[PDB]
Enzyme design. Structure first.
Site, PDB file in Angstrom:
ATOM      1  N   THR A 208      -7.745  47.671   6.328  1.00  0.00           N
ATOM      2  CA  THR A 208      -8.250  46.555   7.156  1.00  0.00           C
ATOM      3  C   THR A 208      -9.512  46.013   6.529  1.00  0.00           C
ATOM      4  OG1 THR A 208      -7.275  47.291   9.270  1.00  0.00           O
ATOM      5  CG2 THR A 208      -9.212  45.977   9.503  1.00  0.00           C
ATOM      6  N   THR A 209      -9.728  44.726   6.732  1.00  0.00           N
ATOM      7  CA  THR A 209     -10.963  44.087   6.343  1.00  0.00           C
ATOM      8  C   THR A 209     -11.323  43.122   7.470  1.00  0.00           C
ATOM      9  OG1 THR A 209     -10.353  44.230   3.974  1.00  0.00           O
ATOM     10  CG2 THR A 209     -12.203  42.925   4.468  1.00  0.00           C
TER      11      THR A 209
END
Lengths: 203, 203, 203, 203, 203, 203, 203, 203, 203, 203
Positions: free
Chosen positions: F1-2
């Site tokens: 995830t970012t």
């Protein structure tokens, strides 16, 4: 630790910072992590200092001996392959290091070598705890069409960004430029400071 | 344990305290932790006492051998490299020590060596459990322009503060000064005591 | 983290830095670690951020309530005892914190409180990973007869030293001075920066 | 920590040092480990600081309450029994402490209580990491026929010996004397200091 | 076990008790823990019985051999160094022992050697489970100005105190005195027994 | 995830990618990780999906409740404190999440909140496995003087760089801009794609 | 990693992607995983890069030596048996690899070899983290009647599908075709790109 | 196990196989893994049978109850959110399951729900040990334009390929198609067999 | 895996299936598990493939060598004794296999050999995960009076039943019959398929 | 243990052996493992005897209560669902059993229920350590066309084969036949013995 090697059309640029920690404890502000190991070859170190320093001494000695024996410098890929074989041999009692080998033979090269002797050539590479920060900058700003001058600025930017976010990185930035014309040149630290000032950077 | 090594313009100052503990149990109040290992070379020890004492005997022997053989003293960086090699060779069954090697060849040097043979040169360095307290004092008070007399006072202040805060540190402060003129010289106890009184300190 | 509380004749000085890390990862350069918790009372926090911030909220609320109910400020020793009781209650499911409580009632006080509710009064105290470096500086330099202005310089110097040697400490130094006459006063950042230049320091 | 209690003909003498450590880190040089908990009753604390401080507050509270309710002081043995019950009740979530309870009811008594509520009366007793050294001095030198001034010198001798050999012990010695005539009396520091000189000791 | 060695002006006094246990089980009441190993050299043993007995046989053998080869006794420090080397060489498969080595060369010396070969000279020293009690008595009562008969009473006092408080210590006290005039002299039991009476002691 | 949240003069910009992995196994290429939770408030989620989704539902419910009861929006700092209290209350049975909360009250704010309820305000922040790459880009290219269009480009670049180097990141970039004038607006996908092309990027 | 080998009437086709990761971290986008090891023999690698690379060097050396010595190429089954003997010999200190060996002797062959030297011939096979996705496509779409143009499309499809669902797979697809007429031929990147474009694919 | 759900323009298609194992042991060849849980809603189960069967009974009961109370079918996203909350609530004592929920409200939906209650909508999804093989087929062959007949074929192909490579998958393929016009329709075995025969497949 | 060997009057019949798994993953559907190792001797393998393949090569080599040296085939019991000694010798670093050795010398024999080299002759035996299912069929249906045709049918039945209940067994059944008259005869696939068709079975 | 349940046209047949062991120790030769639990319902038990026996008592109680309350017998599927709910509820503190439930409502049924309440209907099933041998026989010899006399012989055969190969199975075979006409009928031992004798069996 933060190290980086990039290739340009006729150049390799390699840079590191200098912090040496034990957990949170900053024991040394000026360790050395970038070495000339041959006429047109540089090496960066990350990981366990003792293991890496032994490898640096070996590589210096072996490449000087190879040059004497062969009348030519060891090709950059051959350096990476030598390290690959040495490190994989002791896989189960390893050198706990990450190495970058950069140089010029007929072309510029950067190789990244792991503690099990896995070796991969790349357009650029970073090692140490600060490396993900460097890959951010490089992904965003690197260009193959860069000049040496812009390449030098990029690596300073990238390592400066890593120093801001990685507490195990810090200290002065050491930069070396490797070309066929001038060979391996470590840039004067006053020149690095001037570039730092001009780029609008700190620490 | 607390040890310290500092370089000045043409001198090295080394100092330690003397407490030997097994846990909380002060077995020995006057252990020796500072040693001459060559004409202009000294060494401090921290960590497992039997390991460190074996290293001291070896280093005395090998540095005496080398200069008989070479007709010159081993350069300080060569001393540090040698130890670095020895310690790394046995890193999976280690000498459980931290070492300071200080001395003067063409210049003054202090080297810090860990149990895996990592060796880093510094302007000053400290080892043992009392070392963070020493680094506090040195960060705040060290100057590269100190005279030998000022340096001696500095290390006494630094060790005395470590003794106040590190229960594994104590006893009398041992100090040695290394110059080209006199070589390695251990200061007389009465001199250290006089400086302790005149600095307004204890023990 | 580095925090420090010192008492003087009619004053308490408390200071922190602002670095918030996740291991080596500097997530925030400007966390807050120094809080006014009552008219003449401050508190510094070290340890698990969420535990410490919950305790700050409790303390602000309980001391406000207490002074409304009693019509006088909670005595500093009472603050420390309250916290001691709260933290010891949950000794087996703890707030993973080190706290400093400082202020003035009839006299200046600094209390140091651990995660098991152990609470001890001292003339000065330090918490966090940078604290041994502060203890070094304060052992050699602290004096009961210091004025406020020199006490402020001392804590700036002490935390500046911690920041040089503790990678988990960094960022701007926050300082508050507590007196009967002026109350709890956080020093303006530009005054702290001015003192840093004049003392000859970094960041 | 080192604490001691001795009985004499119509007197109890109780003494401690004042060092508070986390591992080797001397956090406080002047902690308090000797408390009056009733008219003719004292208590010393060793082990976890937060646990022992909570017990001191409870004991001061309950012996005061009991006195008001019974119109006589809690007998020393009843004090040791209350504690015995309290500590044993939470043996599996314990107060990690060693306690001495001393005082006068119809006779001098010293009780030693452990973290599981085991309680034993003795003519003399010592707690903390420094207590083996104290037992040595007491075995060698204690006499039931000693006077108070002799008793006082004895405990000072015993704790000084412990401070020499137990790195977790240190600081000024606190002594209290408990008699039916004068009640519980904490000796002034200058008086302790003067006895240290005339006995030939330190700190 | 309890053993002790003290230096006096021109004398070394060495003493032990004789209890040999497996856990709580007193197997032997009269083990031997004090040995002459050279003309003017004694050694005490603590820790694993089979290990210590092998070392005693080796030391008697080697100091005898060395004497015949050198035509002088091994210097006391050389004795401690030989042992240091031997124990450290097998640190990972150790002799699980604590040793005292005492004797006269050009001066009185006592050395204390650990299972890893760490060796420290001291004015006095004690080993075994009973040694904390002995350190107590010695801290309190030892004087460098003592005569031999005073030294002898001191060690008897110290070991008796240890026997009172260390359940792994017991049995008759063995004392040896070492001087240049009379060499190593083990005191007759009746003489030890007589001193125990006149000092007011037991066993 | 970012995920990333940045503040500008009068604006907050928050962005994410959309990859949901199970180890290496890319289960979903379009998960949603950016949510509007109040009129001028957005939240991003990273960590365990089920935990994060529950917290999204609570937060939408509670800020709606609060707005209705108070007739004003919950202040951004109060949203973070609320979360901080909830996450800390269950820290031994935690929501395994890292959250960003951003929005406008009288000023723009971004808060970063951890699984123990530690909450810190910043000018910018990033969460998830791709966050180090993002911090590299932001360190290098972020400016407080950027316009909204510039800031939107920055976060597309930052997330694009992370996607190139973090295999647990991927998919379409979601972006929300929050202003007092326009409220929370999710930028249309066609518009992000357009900026992706014009910037010289991919995915 | 994703690799695949299929046999057709008179052809072998082998393909890989190029992604090199350390957990989620994409270090190299263009690593090499498919190698010619003899005139009509190729090999793919998966698992630990350093182990695989050493094995690639050994096989290139040994297959060349064999051919020089025998004046014929090692049969593909003999290559697989050699490997199987070598890996099994060291199975308790293993090469941590999965290998595909494919080629033409009198017939096309694909062999799959595991880390313990288990070796099995099949009509097609796939290795690495992406292989389950590949087996999906081949089960559905493989035919023994396919032409070389069709098989090439098929492996591009298999690997493209794997790269969509396996985050440890990525980068350019490499493909070699092996026949008696042309031997081992690596397809030009421009031809694979053209086929990816024609088939309607990405990454 | 292999299960799959796909959305088309106005349809959801869901399918499973039927093998029930205890390790290698095929206990049941004909288990049921696909269930209608509401008028236009189906559910597949994977993971621990007991847990999954209990959830099927709850869902059938709750969706029927909800339909009675609300006079409309629970929206598919509401069904997934219900499951999310339920599974997350018992996160530390979980239902060890993977669920697909498929149906038609105003539009076709497939949701994938994990054992921690993480829930994601997709165009298509698969669960079970056979799912990677299915993702390979779907990535290669799925089109959003497909008709119902084509989608039915796709999922048969996908499950058939999984059965060939996953030994924990096997037995007859169950298929249901969900439309607004026809409702949830479980396809007759004879029809699925005819498609397995037509498409050229096995079992 | 399923393997079986049975003796009849003048015959041995041996049979396997062909499935090669990595957990649930069917890597190869057509592995070989039945080998002729001498004129009248066959061997089946179960367990770790690499180990079992190495043993097959050794046995083929050694029995051929022995036949050349002795001018008679190694007796079947001698073959089993050879394997016994070999496997037992490496008991602590074992071949992780189960073997059946079958053949005719003066009489038919089946031997079963385990990973510790325990070897037992039986009328019949089965190995592999599918073996219990086989033992059920044989116990119910085996007769010592059976003809070769009947024995062939029995083993097909037995392996077919194992394939139905053991997911690690599958693929085509291989059968060999060994007689003095005809030697080791591997039955043509077409013949086994015709028997599977006749007897009314599957796969 | 070995138990089996098979369905025929209008019949259920259930059988067990009777051996009770603690490891290798045969405690009871004639334990009971097959029970009537309702008019047309039987149950077999396997696993921990105390858990199984409690479950037999509950089912007899509850099936009787249900029938009294409903005036009809609980459907066999309802029995299986009840069990499945009960076992799943306590799955983290489980009944450590495998259960067969068989009977007749409008049709014959056999259900198999595991320790986590997973419940599956099948045409036949077997539980316990002997079940793999049983599945061997049933796979080979079961027909849906069998008569009750044939099915009875078949289960006697299955179990007899299991008793030959499973040392945890042994003793007399119990058999019940369930039909609408006669209900649940336990076969007399003399009839089973006669069939064992007629079929040519033992134990």
């Amino acid at each position: 630790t933060t190290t980086v090697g990039i290739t340009l059309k006729d150049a390799v640029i390699m840079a590191t910072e200098r912090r040496v920690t034990m957990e949170n404890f900053i024991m040394h502000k000026n360790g050395k992590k970038l070495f000339q190991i041959d006429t047109y070859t540089g090496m960066t170190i990350a990981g366990l200092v003792g293991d890496a320093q032994v490898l640096v001494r070996y590589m210096k000695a072996e490449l000087e001996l190879y040059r004497l024996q062969r009348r030519v410098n060891m090709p950059i890929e051959a350096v990476a392959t030598l390290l690959s074989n040495m490190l994989n041999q002791v896989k189960y009692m390893p050198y706990m290091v990450q190495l970058l080998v950069g140089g010029i033979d007929t072309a510029p090269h950067v190789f990244s070598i792991d503690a099990a002797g896995g070796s991969v050539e790349d357009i650029y590479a970073s090692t140490g705890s600060g490396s993900p920060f460097v890959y951010g900058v490089l992904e965003s700003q690197y260009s193959e069409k860069m000049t040496v001058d812009e390449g030098v600025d990029l690596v300073i930017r990238a390592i400066s960004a890593a120093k801001q976010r990685d507490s195990a990185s810090g200290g002065m930035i050491d930069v070396a430029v490797i070309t066929r014309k001038d060979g391996y040149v470590q840039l004067p630290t006053d020149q690095i400071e001037s570039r730092i000032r001009k780029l609008g950077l700190i620490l």
